[PDB]
Amino acid sequence: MEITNVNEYEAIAKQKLPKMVYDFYASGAEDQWTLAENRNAFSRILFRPRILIDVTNIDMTTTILGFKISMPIMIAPTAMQKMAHPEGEYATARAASAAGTIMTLSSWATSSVEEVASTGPGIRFFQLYVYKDRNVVAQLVRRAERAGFKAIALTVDTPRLGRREADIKNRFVLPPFLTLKNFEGIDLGLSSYVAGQIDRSLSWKDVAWLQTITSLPILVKGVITAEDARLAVQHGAAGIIVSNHGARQLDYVPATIMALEEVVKAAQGRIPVFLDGGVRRGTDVFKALALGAAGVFIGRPVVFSLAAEGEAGVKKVLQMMRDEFELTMALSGCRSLKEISRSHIAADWD
Amino acid sequence: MEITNVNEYEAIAKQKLPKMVYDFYASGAEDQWTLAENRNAFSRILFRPRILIDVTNIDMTTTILGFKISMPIMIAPTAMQKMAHPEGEYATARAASAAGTIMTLSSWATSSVEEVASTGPGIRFFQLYVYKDRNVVAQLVRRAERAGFKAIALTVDTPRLGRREADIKNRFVLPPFLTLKNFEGIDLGKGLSSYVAGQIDRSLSWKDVAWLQTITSLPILVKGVITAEDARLAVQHGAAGIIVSNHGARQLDYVPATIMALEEVVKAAQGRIPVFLDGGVRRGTDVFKALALGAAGVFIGRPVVFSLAAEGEAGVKKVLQMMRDEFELTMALSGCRSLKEISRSHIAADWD
Ligand SMILES: Cc1cc2nc3c(=O)[nH]c(=O)nc-3n(C[C@H](O)[C@H](O)[C@H](O)COP(=O)(O)O)c2cc1C
Numbered sequence: 134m135e136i137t138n139v140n141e142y143e144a145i146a147k148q149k150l151p152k153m154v155y156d157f158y159a160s161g162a163e164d165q166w167t168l169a170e171n172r173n174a175f176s177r178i179l180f181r182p183r184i185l186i187d188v189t190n191i192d193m194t195t196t197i198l199g200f201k202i203s204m205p206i207m208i209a210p211t212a213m214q215k216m217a218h219p220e221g222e223y224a225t226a227r228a229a230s231a232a233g234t235i236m237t238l239s240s241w242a243t244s245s246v247e248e249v250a251s252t253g254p255g256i257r258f259f260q261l262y263v264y265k266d267r268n269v270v271a272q273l274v275r276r277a278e279r280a281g282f283k284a285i286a287l288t289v290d291t292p293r294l295g296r297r298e299a300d301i302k303n304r305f306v307l308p309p310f311l312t313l314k315n316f317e318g319i320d321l322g323l324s325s326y327v328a329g330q331i332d333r334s335l336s337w338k339d340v341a342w343l344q345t346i347t348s349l350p351i352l353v354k355g356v357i358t359a360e361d362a363r364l365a366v367q368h369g370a371a372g373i374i375v376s377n378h379g380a381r382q383l384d385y386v387p388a389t390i391m392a393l394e395e396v397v398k399a400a401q402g403r404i405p406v407f408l409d410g411g412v413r414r415g416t417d418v419f420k421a422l423a424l425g426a427a428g429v430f431i432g433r434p435v436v437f438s439l440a441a442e443g444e445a446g447v448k449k450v451l452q453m454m455r456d457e458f459e460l461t462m463a464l465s466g467c468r469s470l471k472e473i474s475r476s477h478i479a480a481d482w483d
Numbered sequence: 484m485e486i487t488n489v490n491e492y493e494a495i496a497k498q499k500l501p502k503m504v505y506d507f508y509a510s511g512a513e514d515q516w517t518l519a520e521n522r523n524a525f526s527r528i529l530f531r532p533r534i535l536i537d538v539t540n541i542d543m544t545t546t547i548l549g550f551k552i553s554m555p556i557m558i559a560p561t562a563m564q565k566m567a568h569p570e571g572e573y574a575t576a577r578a579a580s581a582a583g584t585i586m587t588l589s590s591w592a593t594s595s596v597e598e599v600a601s602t603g604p605g606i607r608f609f610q611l612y613v614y615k616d617r618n619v620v621a622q623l624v625r626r627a628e629r630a631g632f633k634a635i636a637l638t639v640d641t642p643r644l645g646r647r648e649a650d651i652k653n654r655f656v657l658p659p660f661l662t663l664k665n666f667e668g669i670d671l672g673k674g675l676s677s678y679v680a681g682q683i684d685r686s687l688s689w690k691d692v693a694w695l696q697t698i699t700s701l702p703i704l705v706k707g708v709i710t711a712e713d714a715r716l717a718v719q720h721g722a723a724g725i726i727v728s729n730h731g732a733r734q735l736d737y738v739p740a741t742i743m744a745l746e747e748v749v750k751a752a753q754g755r756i757p758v759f760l761d762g763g764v765r766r767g768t769d770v771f772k773a774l775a776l777g778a779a780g781v782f783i784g785r786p787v788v789f790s791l792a793a794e795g796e797a798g799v800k801k802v803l804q805m806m807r808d809e810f811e812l813t814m815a816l817s818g819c820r821s822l823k824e825i826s827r828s829h830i831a832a833d834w835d
Pocket residue numbers: 507508509521559560561562563589590591610638641706728729730731732733761762763764782783784785786
């Protein structure tokens with residue numbers, strides 16, 4: 134018994150919630166292509182432990198944009214799960230302290246910006262989108278603040294949505310007793326309005342154009358090819374993370390991996406590098422974490438455990454990686470990310 | 484050698500600011516009749532001491548909306564006060580914070596809600612300013628999220644805004660460099676200074692008042708009342724706290740003085756919710772009165788700006804200790820040990 138295997142939640146799930154509905158969380162838009170390698174490329178790349186490492190003091194817990202987090206296994210902009218909950222989403226809140234790190238969510242993530250965090254003194258990372266005008270966007274500046282909802286990040290990839298006809302192929306709408314609780318009281322109603330943001334304003338013309346607008350940081354997400362990404366660096370925001378909707382948006386997109394050093398090279402340091410690929414067993418997250426990482430990005434993973442174990446639920450998960458990967462860390466020795474290296478990780482591709 | 488008069492400032496900080504600045508802060512609607520009827524108004528309420536009592540200790544200490552604002556005087560949301568010392572809004576939050584009260588800022592702010600809050604730990608409110616299309620509002624309202632602006636001073640008296648002469652002769656040049664970083668620049672999607680002078684909804688109603696509620700909690704106040712027809716109306720429509728006002732006598736003139744118009748506004752909504760009048764108030768002598776009429780706590784405007792503009796974070800920091808250190812004479816000499824023992828039982832007022 135007990136919770137050991139990460140995808141132990143995967144069976145249970147089948148018989149824990151509605152399909153139509155869950156079809157919003159984990160679901161790969163397009164050809165099931167990118168969710169495969171996402172659980173298979175680091176499952177591909179190996180590591181050869183460094184030998185006889187004396188240990189006393191270890192850095193699992195680390196200084197990032199200030200703070201020394203135990204496990205920076207930060208999330209990623211989430212979405213639509215109140216029909217996957219009783220007492221709330223202050224779970225992933227009370228978690229970013231228990232299983233402390235970067236809490237990141239979305240506006241579809243139907244929680245009240247102030248309410249979820251009703252458990253603690255930490256910072257926060259908002260889900261953006263270049264919403265179909267600026268009465269829709271721009272105003273994100275007007276929310277996710279320093280002394281509050283800390284850092285920003287403009288989604289430099291999406292201006293339409295990945296069509297995975299799971300829920301799409303049936304009768305879905307949404308829980309009556311809900312809306313997009315974040316966007317709610319708007320220039321609405323809160324039925325269709327919010328979707329009408331889909332427009333291809335794919336330019337930096339409205340990116341650095343915004344830095345003179347916000348005082349808040351901007352980990353502009355979605356940067357899977359330094360080949361316009363050098364430009365996502367030549368022009369841009371901050372901590373620029375490669376991200377393919379979490380193994381989708383266009384299932385056939387390569388896993389967020391390959392762009393790892395291909396962008397950490399066409400950007401390096403500067404305004405940071407990251408990757409959004411699925412990393413369930415507390416090793417997988419480690420892989421990319423060496424070859425091109427700073428925190429430990431997620432979102433939906435906690436979505437089984439966000440869906441079936443409450444506040445705690447998600448907390449343990451990050452531990453499923455903080456315990457897990459620290460095992461790794463101290464196992465093959467290394468006690469900080471600087472001593473962490475490439476030729477120790479037995480990567481197939483170099 | 485040190486000089487004390489809580490407005491001896493007005494005139495010094497008058498010579499410190501460019502015409503436009505002083506007049507932007509020192510105006511009133513057209514004839515400005517109610518400007519002096521904002522001060523010579525409290526003079527029509529005669530005191531009424533009680534004597535031979537224990538005054539070793541007193542008590543300014545409050546709790547407005549479940550908030551102990553250190554002392555009963557608060558700050559009212561003045562527009563760009565960064566023009567009047569490039570810091571303003573920013574150093575007012577820190578000033579009040581050290582002063583333990585509220586630092587209330589408007590949407591017409593120089594420093595944004597992102598920007599000011601870096602000042603750190605302390606109680607503060609933010610004035611809502613509903614606009615034509617409510618997508619930008621909706622997001623501003625939820626900006627002061629679990630950052631903490633506690634309430635929202637929704638300003639019900641500013642659809643078409645008051646005709647303060649001055650401005651439109653010495654045509655108010657919104658200082659090229661300097662910006663209203665609270666929106667700073669929005670647009671739908673196809674500007675600053677006149678974006679803000681490019682947005683608002685002249686049809687704000689108790690139906691919009693409805694909507695605002697499903698987009699938040701943050702105790703929605705009623706800013707801009709001087710009658711009891713919109714007072715009982717104010718409890719009729721779910722809320723707490725009122726911000727009875729004239730708008731620094733900036734929206735409409737010849738409309739009663741906050742103090743004078745007060746009795747009917749408090750007396751109307753009884754025990755439902757507490758009222759706070761932000762206007763006229765420049766001494767604890769006269770501050771006392773408001774609290775006597777039934778307005779549990781009061782905000783402050785102009786007096787707070789002719790201080791930053793005058794002398795930095797020390798400016799307002801006397802505007803508050805001079806103010807606070809003036810309610811400990813008033814409460815003392817009238818026989819009171821704290822707010823509990825005040826009330827208009829304890830006085831006399833001209834009209835009556
Ligand atoms: C420069 C200036 C701009 C103002 N703009 C606003 C505003 O944006 N909205 C609002 O409700 N109050 C505004 N106020 C008025 C106050 O919030 C407050 O009612 C007033 O200044 C208190 O009057 P007193 O100055 O005699 O204390 C303005 C006042 C001044 C001095």
